[PDB]
């Protein structure tokens, strides 16, 4: 569907014996909207849950380099007198430094709207692939019409850097957004923490300390206010564990957590407060179950030790012989078991062998029952949310099958080694990185799969609940008994929100011709016998003629393991001397344009005397010499580029070819680039409504039908000998 929202393609596919992968294609028409087009796929049996992706449709050409706009810190302290110092790192796609000129502007993102700071516009040089600029503090206060520093907190800062090459043949706009203005470099979150505690037990605060953009913090000491001895440290997952002691009385626990970073003042420490309620026993019978898991982070294959601990009177003891444990993973029961508890054991330990089907997290729900406590049946439960380290269920690694001591060349056969599960179907793509320069979002990653899974779980609250029915409801369970104890009513699908020398004819140059923006759309099967469960496939791919970095992304799809998105493998293709033909996207017919051939020379010591040549194409008009081809001799200094201009007047509509061949004097090399460009006539794409009609067969027409005659299009400003597309839309008007 288009950015208007109407579906322009509808397809019915079946994934039967395809091993879960459905490849599809769609040709974009030339008469087309521009913007964020969307793909919406859904299952037939569940036609209201829609899985969507987005792709931009835009008229572009591929850039030759990337621009990274990195501020020195990922936030902005409002009392920092040095301002916001950012660094512009312009790097070529084949891994070379960029000499150029950056125009850097700043602005305040205030919610959904943004305002610029026009006095903050700076023009800086970029030498050796880097440049530095500082937005001053006083420019930021006088740019904002509101007074004081304190109202800038909450609003974000964005920086747009537009980098011009020194030849001027290419520019890249890159925007770094979402730099918040904060009074504290950290943020305290209680989201992985239970909101319910057992009174008389330790309460394990699982405090999530974050950077203010949303990234997890690391090695940040936090402490409960009033309990200075409990000073923990933030681990690599961003969350620190603080086990405090709770008094045995039914009161709400007010927990205030502050950071204890040594290099900040007391006003820069992030605090947050939580009211945690006590677990409610039935009949205030003082029977609690405590579920102690001494966890930091778990790889699969290791083990943890669940500590069941009873808290009840001895007059009813030796009536508890087991604790039932259940594992909830991905919204369904993974493993249910009993743990035998001999009488006299206040604490028992159950070893959970964390296998690979515990990814991404699980909920250990445990309970027991007791009949003779006060004459009626009593169910006492607990639950804990344990986070496994999120990885693939199987594995998929794409790397170089060859030695890769050499740098690859355009057209060179390259050996790709794919290591995965046995029998998995591996699908691949190899994408030019300038596509990721233009549009970076909506990429398939493994973490996106696990947050799709993590947002579709049925457990609401981590840890315990209000009572046993609260524990089972927040875990995502219904417990029902014959006596009458049951979980409360769940009826909502979501969780509730809380001249001569012809050097070009002598060297028989075949031209670099294939420049795809994406290739290697291949389907492979790992049918090799596995070595320790890993099948290795070698592939002989042929590299395309673009001088860039190809990003190769492979997804393995296995019957016993599942979907694993690999890490992207980067193949950098680069020569020492080459041609970059900087054609535009489209050229208006019968107008004069100038195109650029940027010859790059990357020798460390020697300059190059390069004979360059535009081949004569009869579709373009150019200068007609006695020799029909147009050649000259340039000199390129070492580690540098030179832009050669060519003026052409195109005369024919369509995909015309431009060929530039160059050969180095006194050296046995050459290059040649043949690229096609679109030549459009002089008009402008402009839509015109043929009709809007209301269909009603019982009110309009006769005999139960209604005949509507679509007229032909009444365009009089149309360009002659050009294509037009008439779009028909029928829509069902809802009635109430």
């Amino acid at each position: 569907e288009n950015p208007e929202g109407i579906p322009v393609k509808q397809d019915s596919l079946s994934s039967q014996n395809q091993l879960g992968v459905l490849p599809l294609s769609w040709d974009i028409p030339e008469l087309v909207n521009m913007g964020q087009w969307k793909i919406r796929a859904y299952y037939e049996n569940s036609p209201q849950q829609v899985f969507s992706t987005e792709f931009e449709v835009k008229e572009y050409v591929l850039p030759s380099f990337e621009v990274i706009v990195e501020p020195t810190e990922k936030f902005y302290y409002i009392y920092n007198e040095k301002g916001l110092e950012v660094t512009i790192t312009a790097r070529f796609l084949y891994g070379k430094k960029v000499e150029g000129t950056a125009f850097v502007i700043f602005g305040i993102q205030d919610g959904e709207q943004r305002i610029s700071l026009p006095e903050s516009l700076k023009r800086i040089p970029i030498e050796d692939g880097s440049g530095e600029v500082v937005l001053s503090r006083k420019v930021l206060l006088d740019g904002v019409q509101n007074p004081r520093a304190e109202d800038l907190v909450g609003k974000s800062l964005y920086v747009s850097a537009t980098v011009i090459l020194h030849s001027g043949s290419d520019m890249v706009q890159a925007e770094r957004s979402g730099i918040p203005i904060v009074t504290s470099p950290y943020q305290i979150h209680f989201t992985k923490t239970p909101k319910y505690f057992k009174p008389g037990m330790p309460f394990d605060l699982m405090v999530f300390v974050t950077n203010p953009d949303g990234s997890p913090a690391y090695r940040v000491p936090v402490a409960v206010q009033g309990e200075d001895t409990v000073q923990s440290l933030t681990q690599g997952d961003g969350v620190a564990k603080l086990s405090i002691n709770t008094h045995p009385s039914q009161k709400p626990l007010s927990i205030t957590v502050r950071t204890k970073k040594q290099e900040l003042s007391e006003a820069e420490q992030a605090t947050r407060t939580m009211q945690a309620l006590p677990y409610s026993t039935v009949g205030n019978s003082n029977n609690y179950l405590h579920l102690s898991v001494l966890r930091t982070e778990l790889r699969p294959g290791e083990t943890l030790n669940v500590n069941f601990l009873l808290r009840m009177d001895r007059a009813h003891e030796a009536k508890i012989r087991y604790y039932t444990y259940l594992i909830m993973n991905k919204g369904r029961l993974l493993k249910a078991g009993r743990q035998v508890r001999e009488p006299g054991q206040d604490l028992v330990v159950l070893p959970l062998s964390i296998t690979t089907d515990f990814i991404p997290s699980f909920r250990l729900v445990a309970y027991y029952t007791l009949i003779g406590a006060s004459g009626q049946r009593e169910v006492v439960a607990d639950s804990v949310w344990v986070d496994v380290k999120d990885s693939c269920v199987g594995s998929l690694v794409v790397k170089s099958g060859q030695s890769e001591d050499r740098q690859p060349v355009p057209g060179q056969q390259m050996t790709l080694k794919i290591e995965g599960d046995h029998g998995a179907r591996v699908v691949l793509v190899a994408v030019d990185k300038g596509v990721f320069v233009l549009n970076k979002k909506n990429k398939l990653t493994q973490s996106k799969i696990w947050d799709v899974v993590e947002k579709a779980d049925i457990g609401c609250t981590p840890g315990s609940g209000k009572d046993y029915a609260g524990v089972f409801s927040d875990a995502g369970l219904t417990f029902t008994s014959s006596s009458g104890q049951q979980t409360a009513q769940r009826a909502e699908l979501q969780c509730p929100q809380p001249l001569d020398e012809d050097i070009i004819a002598e060297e028989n140059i075949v031209s670099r011709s294939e420049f795809p923006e994406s290739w290697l759309w291949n389907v492979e099967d790992l049918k090799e016998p596995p070595k320790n469960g890993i099948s290795t496939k070698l592939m002989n791919i042929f590299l395309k003629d673009s001088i860039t970095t190809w990003e190769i992304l492979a997804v393995s799809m296995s019957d016993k393991k599942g979907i694993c998105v690999a890490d992207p493998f980067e193949v950098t293709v680069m020569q020492d001397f080459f041609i970059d033909l900087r054609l535009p996207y489209s050229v208006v017919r019968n107008e004069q344009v100038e195109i650029r051939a940027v010859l790059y020379n990357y020798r460390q010591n020697q300059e190059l005397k390069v004979r360059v040549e535009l081949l004569h194409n009869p579709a373009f008009c150019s200068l007609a010499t006695t020799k029909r081809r147009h050649q000259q001799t340039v000199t390129i200094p070492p580690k540098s580029s030179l832009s050669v201009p060519y003026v052409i007047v195109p005369l024919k509509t369509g995909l015309q070819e431009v060929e530039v061949k160059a050969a180095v004097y006194h050296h046995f090399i050459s290059d040649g680039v043949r690229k096609s460009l679109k030549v459009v006539p002089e008009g402008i794409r402009m839509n015109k409504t043929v009709a809007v009609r209301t269909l009603d067969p019982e009110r309009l027409g006769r005999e139960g039908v209604q005949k509507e005659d679509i007229p032909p299009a009444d365009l009089s400003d149309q360009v002659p000998d050009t294509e037009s597309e008439t779009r028909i839309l029928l829509q069902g008007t809802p009635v109430a």
Partner: nanobody
Amino acid sequence: QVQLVETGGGLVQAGGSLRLSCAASGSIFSINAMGWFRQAPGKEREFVATINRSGGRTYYADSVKGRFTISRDNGKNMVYLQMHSLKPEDTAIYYCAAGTGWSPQTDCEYNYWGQGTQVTVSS
């Protein structure tokens, strides 16, 4: 990487002719330059000839200009050097070398080398 052998050396009379064969194990079609380098007894390993990827560009040294001819055949990866009108100062060990085309008249970029044939012209 390639393996590179040379065949066709030996005893040659003065004013005669010689033909050799530089045989490459692998693919010749990605090698920008191959050259013939001779080595006199008691002297350097200096440049004699080199040929382009397409065979359209030849470079010879100054002493060998009107008398030597280098050819390349990419069908079966074979580079041939032909002498007419031998002088007795061409008594040398001849090696064939593969390089990436950068400065093809110097040996410092020819990465892959052979073992060479002894060519003795008698006067």
